[PDB]
Protein backbone atom coordinates (compact mmCIF):
# COMPACT_ATOMS: atom_id res chain seq x y z
CA UNK A 1 0.00 0.00 0.00
CA UNK A 2 0.99 3.89 -0.12
CA UNK A 3 1.28 2.84 3.59
CA UNK A 4 4.55 1.73 3.03
CA UNK A 5 5.41 4.86 1.04
CA UNK A 6 3.99 6.59 4.67
CA UNK A 7 5.95 4.77 6.88
CA UNK A 8 9.12 5.42 4.50
CA UNK A 9 8.46 8.92 4.38
CA UNK A 10 7.82 9.36 7.92
CA UNK A 11 11.02 7.69 8.90
CA UNK A 12 13.57 10.00 6.49
CA UNK A 13 11.64 13.08 7.80
CA UNK A 14 11.41 13.76 3.99
CA UNK A 15 7.68 15.17 4.12
CA UNK A 16 9.07 18.53 3.75
CA UNK A 17 10.55 17.68 0.61
CA UNK A 18 8.05 15.34 -1.13
CA UNK A 19 5.51 18.44 -0.60
CA UNK A 20 8.69 21.21 -2.23
CA UNK A 21 8.62 18.54 -4.89
CA UNK A 22 4.64 18.55 -5.79
CA UNK A 23 4.80 21.83 -5.09
CA UNK A 24 7.17 22.92 -8.07
CA UNK A 25 5.95 20.49 -10.39
CA UNK A 26 2.10 21.84 -10.16
CA UNK A 27 0.70 23.50 -12.69
CA UNK A 28 0.63 27.16 -13.51
CA UNK A 29 -2.23 28.45 -15.81
CA UNK A 30 -3.32 31.82 -16.10
CA UNK A 31 -5.81 33.93 -13.76
CA UNK A 32 -6.65 36.83 -16.30
CA UNK A 33 -10.37 37.16 -15.53
CA UNK A 34 -9.72 37.09 -11.95
CA UNK A 35 -6.82 40.27 -12.23
CA UNK A 36 -9.22 42.35 -13.53
CA UNK A 37 -9.46 45.84 -11.72
CA UNK A 38 -13.72 45.49 -11.74
CA UNK A 39 -13.25 41.83 -10.09
CA UNK A 40 -10.90 43.07 -7.10
CA UNK A 41 -13.99 43.56 -4.68
CA UNK A 42 -15.14 39.61 -5.79
CA UNK A 43 -11.64 38.18 -4.59
CA UNK A 44 -11.15 37.34 -0.73
CA UNK A 45 -7.54 38.47 0.56
CA UNK A 46 -4.97 36.20 0.68
CA UNK A 47 -7.00 33.46 -1.13
CA UNK A 48 -6.11 31.79 -4.54
CA UNK A 49 -7.13 32.91 -7.64
CA UNK A 50 -9.11 30.28 -9.89
CA UNK A 51 -7.09 29.51 -13.48
CA UNK A 52 -9.23 30.82 -16.36
CA UNK A 53 -9.77 27.65 -18.09
CA UNK A 54 -11.26 25.97 -15.41
CA UNK A 55 -13.52 29.03 -13.52
CA UNK A 56 -16.97 28.73 -13.16
CA UNK A 57 -19.37 31.64 -14.64
CA UNK A 58 -21.96 33.12 -13.19
CA UNK A 59 -25.12 33.44 -15.81
CA UNK A 60 -24.94 37.58 -16.00
CA UNK A 61 -24.13 39.34 -18.66
CA UNK A 62 -22.39 42.43 -16.80
CA UNK A 63 -20.17 40.29 -14.57
CA UNK A 64 -19.96 36.85 -14.48
CA UNK A 65 -16.93 36.09 -12.45
CA UNK A 66 -16.49 34.20 -8.98
CA UNK A 67 -13.73 32.90 -7.37
CA UNK A 68 -14.46 29.31 -7.48
CA UNK A 69 -12.46 26.62 -10.24
CA UNK A 70 -14.30 23.42 -11.05
CA UNK A 71 -12.11 20.14 -10.28
CA UNK A 72 -13.12 17.35 -12.76
CA UNK A 73 -11.64 14.12 -12.09
CA UNK A 74 -12.21 12.20 -15.42
CA UNK A 75 -11.26 8.59 -14.18
CA UNK A 76 -13.28 9.05 -10.76
CA UNK A 77 -16.46 10.28 -12.32
CA UNK A 78 -16.42 13.35 -9.67
CA UNK A 79 -16.80 16.51 -10.28
CA UNK A 80 -16.17 19.41 -7.37
CA UNK A 81 -16.40 23.18 -7.14
CA UNK A 82 -14.18 24.79 -5.26
CA UNK A 83 -14.58 28.17 -3.96
CA UNK A 84 -13.53 30.93 -1.69
CA UNK A 85 -15.94 31.45 1.70
CA UNK A 86 -18.20 34.25 0.68
CA UNK A 87 -17.40 37.75 1.14
CA UNK A 88 -20.55 40.14 2.81
CA UNK A 89 -20.76 41.32 -1.28
CA UNK A 90 -20.55 38.08 -3.01
CA UNK A 91 -23.29 35.91 -0.99
CA UNK A 92 -26.07 36.53 -3.63
CA UNK A 93 -23.42 35.64 -6.66
CA UNK A 94 -22.30 32.10 -4.54
CA UNK A 95 -26.31 31.23 -4.16
CA UNK A 96 -26.42 32.00 -7.93
CA UNK A 97 -23.28 29.38 -8.46
CA UNK A 98 -25.06 26.95 -6.33
CA UNK A 99 -28.11 27.82 -8.43
CA UNK A 100 -27.07 27.80 -11.56
CA UNK A 101 -24.85 24.86 -10.94
CA UNK A 102 -27.34 22.56 -9.58
CA UNK A 103 -25.31 21.80 -6.77
CA UNK A 104 -27.17 19.08 -4.50
CA UNK A 105 -24.62 19.95 -1.63
CA UNK A 106 -22.15 22.76 -0.14
CA UNK A 107 -19.29 21.77 2.02
CA UNK A 108 -17.84 24.46 4.70
CA UNK A 109 -14.61 22.77 6.54
CA UNK A 110 -14.42 26.14 8.65
CA UNK A 111 -15.92 27.87 11.18
CA UNK A 112 -17.28 31.54 10.95
CA UNK A 113 -14.67 32.40 13.60
CA UNK A 114 -11.47 31.14 13.56
CA UNK A 115 -8.12 32.19 15.70
CA UNK A 116 -10.51 35.37 16.43
CA UNK A 117 -10.91 36.31 13.14
CA UNK A 118 -13.87 36.49 10.64
CA UNK A 119 -13.20 34.14 7.72
CA UNK A 120 -16.42 34.25 5.86
CA UNK A 121 -19.27 35.85 5.71
CA UNK A 122 -22.29 34.15 7.87
CA UNK A 123 -24.12 33.41 4.09
CA UNK A 124 -26.61 31.18 5.70
CA UNK A 125 -29.59 31.68 8.24
CA UNK A 126 -29.27 30.95 11.61
CA UNK A 127 -33.04 30.86 11.98
CA UNK A 128 -35.95 29.21 10.54
CA UNK A 129 -38.03 32.33 11.11
CA UNK A 130 -35.43 34.59 9.51
CA UNK A 131 -35.02 34.11 6.13
CA UNK A 132 -32.20 35.63 3.80
CA UNK A 133 -32.93 37.33 0.46
CA UNK A 134 -29.98 38.40 -1.87
CA UNK A 135 -31.39 41.02 -3.93
CA UNK A 136 -28.50 41.33 -6.08
CA UNK A 137 -29.36 37.66 -7.49
CA UNK A 138 -32.88 37.27 -6.65
CA UNK A 139 -32.79 34.05 -4.36
CA UNK A 140 -34.26 33.54 -0.86
CA UNK A 141 -32.10 30.87 0.89
CA UNK A 142 -34.70 29.55 4.71
CA UNK A 143 -33.21 27.30 6.62
CA UNK A 144 -35.22 24.06 7.14
CA UNK A 145 -33.29 22.08 9.65
CA UNK A 146 -30.12 21.91 11.97
CA UNK A 147 -28.58 18.44 13.09
CA UNK A 148 -25.46 19.67 15.68
CA UNK A 149 -22.97 16.58 15.80
CA UNK A 150 -19.59 16.62 17.76
CA UNK A 151 -17.72 16.99 14.97
CA UNK A 152 -19.90 18.26 12.42
CA UNK A 153 -23.10 20.16 11.53
CA UNK A 154 -26.20 19.30 8.66
CA UNK A 155 -28.49 22.00 7.55
CA UNK A 156 -31.25 21.24 5.29
CA UNK A 157 -31.86 24.77 3.36
CA UNK A 158 -34.24 25.94 0.51
CA UNK A 159 -33.38 28.20 -2.20
CA UNK A 160 -35.63 29.83 -4.22
CA UNK A 161 -35.15 31.32 -7.24
CA UNK A 162 -37.39 33.99 -6.65
CA UNK A 163 -37.90 35.01 -10.80
CA UNK A 164 -39.05 31.50 -11.32
CA UNK A 165 -40.64 30.40 -7.83
CA UNK A 166 -38.69 27.21 -8.77
CA UNK A 167 -37.43 25.81 -4.72
CA UNK A 168 -34.77 23.36 -4.24
CA UNK A 169 -33.00 21.79 -1.51
CA UNK A 170 -29.74 22.38 -0.51
CA UNK A 171 -28.22 20.19 2.22
CA UNK A 172 -25.03 22.01 3.88
CA UNK A 173 -22.50 19.99 5.77
CA UNK A 174 -20.42 22.01 7.72
CA UNK A 175 -17.29 20.15 9.74
CA UNK A 176 -16.75 22.16 13.00
CA UNK A 177 -13.90 20.77 14.58
CA UNK A 178 -10.96 21.73 11.95
CA UNK A 179 -8.26 22.71 14.44
CA UNK A 180 -6.79 26.52 14.18
CA UNK A 181 -3.27 25.63 13.83
CA UNK A 182 -2.04 22.23 12.25
CA UNK A 183 -3.70 19.18 11.16
CA UNK A 184 -6.31 16.99 12.84
CA UNK A 185 -4.59 14.37 14.99
CA UNK A 186 -6.35 11.23 13.63
CA UNK A 187 -8.49 11.29 10.72
CA UNK A 188 -11.26 9.77 11.82
CA UNK A 189 -13.65 11.95 12.30
CA UNK A 190 -12.91 13.75 8.89
CA UNK A 191 -13.00 10.28 6.99
CA UNK A 192 -16.90 10.17 9.11
CA UNK A 193 -18.03 13.69 7.95
CA UNK A 194 -16.83 13.02 4.14
CA UNK A 195 -18.43 9.46 4.51
CA UNK A 196 -21.65 11.78 5.78
CA UNK A 197 -21.58 14.24 2.29
CA UNK A 198 -21.52 10.85 0.16
CA UNK A 199 -24.25 9.20 1.72
CA UNK A 200 -26.34 12.30 1.19
CA UNK A 201 -26.00 12.05 -2.39
CA UNK A 202 -24.16 15.09 -2.59
CA UNK A 203 -21.25 14.03 -4.47
CA UNK A 204 -23.60 12.01 -6.77
CA UNK A 205 -23.53 12.55 -10.68
CA UNK A 206 -27.35 12.99 -10.63
CA UNK A 207 -26.28 16.10 -9.30
CA UNK A 208 -24.39 19.05 -9.91
CA UNK A 209 -20.74 19.53 -8.43
CA UNK A 210 -20.78 19.68 -4.35
CA UNK A 211 -19.32 23.41 -3.36
CA UNK A 212 -16.56 23.01 -1.41
CA UNK A 213 -14.81 26.15 0.53
CA UNK A 214 -12.47 26.83 3.26
CA UNK A 215 -10.73 29.41 4.89
CA UNK A 216 -8.32 31.83 2.94
CA UNK A 217 -5.47 30.21 1.18
CA UNK A 218 -5.29 27.38 4.08
CA UNK A 219 -6.16 23.95 2.32
CA UNK A 220 -9.08 22.26 4.03
CA UNK A 221 -10.98 21.84 0.33
CA UNK A 222 -8.45 20.18 -1.41
CA UNK A 223 -7.79 17.62 1.42
CA UNK A 224 -11.71 16.76 1.20
CA UNK A 225 -11.70 16.57 -2.75
CA UNK A 226 -8.17 14.50 -2.75
CA UNK A 227 -9.26 12.04 -0.03
CA UNK A 228 -12.46 11.28 -1.76
CA UNK A 229 -11.06 10.70 -5.39
CA UNK A 230 -8.00 8.52 -4.41
CA UNK A 231 -10.79 6.36 -2.00
CA UNK A 232 -13.17 5.70 -4.98
CA UNK A 233 -10.10 5.18 -7.66
CA UNK A 234 -9.08 2.44 -5.20
CA UNK A 235 -12.53 1.03 -5.11
CA UNK A 236 -12.61 1.40 -8.99
CA UNK A 237 -9.27 -0.10 -10.29
CA UNK A 238 -8.42 -3.25 -10.65
CA UNK A 239 -5.10 -2.47 -9.16
CA UNK A 240 -6.14 -0.49 -6.05
CA UNK A 241 -1.99 -0.26 -4.77
CA UNK A 242 -1.72 1.39 -8.67
CA UNK A 243 -3.32 4.93 -6.88
CA UNK A 244 -0.72 7.49 -6.37
CA UNK A 245 -2.02 9.98 -3.68
CA UNK A 246 1.12 12.32 -5.55
CA UNK A 247 0.15 11.99 -9.00
CA UNK A 248 -3.98 12.33 -8.45
CA UNK A 249 -3.37 15.58 -6.06
CA UNK A 250 -0.99 16.97 -9.12
CA UNK A 251 -3.89 16.36 -11.47
CA UNK A 252 -6.15 18.20 -9.44
CA UNK A 253 -3.90 20.94 -9.23
CA UNK A 254 -4.41 21.51 -12.88
CA UNK A 255 -8.08 22.72 -11.92
CA UNK A 256 -7.25 25.26 -8.86
CA UNK A 257 -3.78 26.25 -6.85
CA UNK A 258 -3.61 26.11 -3.32
CA UNK A 259 -4.99 22.43 -2.79
CA UNK A 260 -2.94 21.13 0.09
CA UNK A 261 -1.15 24.59 1.36
CA UNK A 262 1.52 22.76 3.91
CA UNK A 263 3.54 19.27 4.15
CA UNK A 264 1.64 18.85 7.27
CA UNK A 265 -1.59 18.67 4.99
CA UNK A 266 -0.08 16.38 2.73
CA UNK A 267 0.92 13.92 5.07
CA UNK A 268 -2.54 14.16 6.66
CA UNK A 269 -4.43 13.58 3.63
CA UNK A 270 -2.22 10.43 3.03
CA UNK A 271 -3.20 9.35 6.39
CA UNK A 272 -6.95 9.80 5.58
CA UNK A 273 -6.65 7.86 2.14
CA UNK A 274 -5.03 5.10 4.23
CA UNK A 275 -7.54 5.19 7.29
CA UNK A 276 -10.41 5.44 5.13
CA UNK A 277 -9.38 2.39 2.69
CA UNK A 278 -9.19 0.20 5.64
CA UNK A 279 -12.56 1.14 6.64
CA UNK A 280 -14.37 0.93 2.83
Known amino acids: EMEKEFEQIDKSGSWAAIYQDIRH ?34 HQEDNDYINASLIKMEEAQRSYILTQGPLPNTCGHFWEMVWEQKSRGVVMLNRVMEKGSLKCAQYWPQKEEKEMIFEDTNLKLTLISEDIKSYYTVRQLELENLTTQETREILHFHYTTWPDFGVPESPASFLNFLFKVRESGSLSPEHGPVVVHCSAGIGRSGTFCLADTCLLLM ?3 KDPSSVDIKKVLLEMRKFRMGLIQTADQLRFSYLAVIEGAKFI
Open 235 to 237: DKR
Open 25 to 58: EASDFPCRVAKLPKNKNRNRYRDVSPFDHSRIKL
